[PDB]
Amino acid sequence: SHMSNKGKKRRNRTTFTSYQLEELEKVFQKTHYPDVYAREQLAMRTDLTEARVQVWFQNRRAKWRKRERFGQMQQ
């Protein structure tokens, strides 16, 4: 991430929707690592493929890596 993502996407604003981000976050907060079977179960429920489950969790854990400890409302 260094002055990246300059390719302006006209195809769809948000790749995900409200219900998809519900299911994705619920799996993420119970376990930051979904196994091969948990990938498939999450995929059929969210209407996404395993490839889209890869992109979400790898990007999401990247932000999660920076332990900030900024305040009492989620460190």
**Cα–Cα distance between 41 and 29 in angstroms, integer?**
16
Which structural domain, as residue segments, surrounds residue 26?
A: 1-75
Paired tokens of 67? 């332990």
CATH number, domain with residue 8: 1.10.10.60
68 close to 41: Cβ distance less than 8 angstroms: no
Technique behind this structure? NMR
**Cα–Cα distance between 75 and 67 in angstroms, integer?**
7
Buried-exposed string 26-42: b where 16+ CB fall within 10 A, e elsewhere: ebbeeeeebeeeebeeb
Give the residue among 20, 32, 38 at the shortest CA–CA distance from 60. 32
The CA angle 41-11-15, to the nearest 5 degrees, is 25
